[PDB]
């Protein structure tokens, strides 16, 4: 039985199937993510270096669920028109659980065939894993700003960028108070 359960299991009829998908997709798409020992563990998860592989998968499914809470409030249909352009001069549309866009997402190998695919919760969550797998492994940390540049998941998601706002403060608090982390 698990030590940590993601927040979508409380909010959504299919939440247990989302968890099952994420645990399997982490083996295929997150192997680099799951090998990092992050430089900001003292902030996010003080006991990170003691966690088993199974415990690290539980941790990352929980953190992804906290990001979903603040990006979409668990609404796979959500779309939002941004204030900046794509490469063709049309405003970017952010979509689905983690508010990913088709041009930026497909540069990570997400393979979205059409805009409808970003509203598929399983494809959306797998793309989030690919984005974390690249930046957390390249930068060696979960988030933060170093020498003027955002690092880790904060490269892509505003909710992971430090500041005096409810999303960031809540994600950090919930992470660091998990029983496995404290």
UniProtKB/TrEMBL annotation:
Keywords: Signal. Residues 53-138 form the Transglycosylase SLT domain. It comes from Bdellovibrio bacteriovorus (strain ATCC 15356 / DSM 50701 / NCIMB 9529 / HD100). This is Transglycosylase SLT domain-containing protein. Disulfide bonds join 45-181, 110-127. Transmembrane segments: none annotated.
């Amino acid at each position: 039985s698990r030590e940590v359960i993601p927040l979508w299991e409380d909010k959504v009829a299919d939440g247990k199937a989302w968890s099952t998908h994420v645990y399997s997709a982490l083996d295929k798409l997150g192997p680099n993510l799951l090998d990092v020992i992050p430089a900001d563990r003292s902030l996010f998860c003080p006991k990170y270096s003691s966690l088993s592989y199974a415990q690290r998968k539980q941790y990352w499914a929980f953190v992804l669920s906290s990001m979903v809470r603040f990006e979409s409030n668990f609404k796979t249909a959500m779309s939002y028109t941004e204030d900046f352009n794509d490469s063709n001069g049309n405003r970017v549309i952010s979509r689905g659980l983690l508010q990913i866009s088709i041009e930026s997402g497909n540069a990570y190998g997400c393979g979205f065939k059409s805009t409808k695919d970003l509203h598929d919760p399983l494809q959306n969550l797998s793309c989030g894993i690919r984005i974390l797998d690249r930046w957390v492994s390249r930068d060696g940390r979960i988030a933060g700003k170093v020498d003027g540049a955002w690092k880790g998941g904060a490269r892509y998601w505003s909710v992971l960028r430090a500041g005096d706002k409810t999303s960031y403060k809540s994600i950090v608090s919930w992470s660091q108070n998990l029983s496995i982390c404290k």
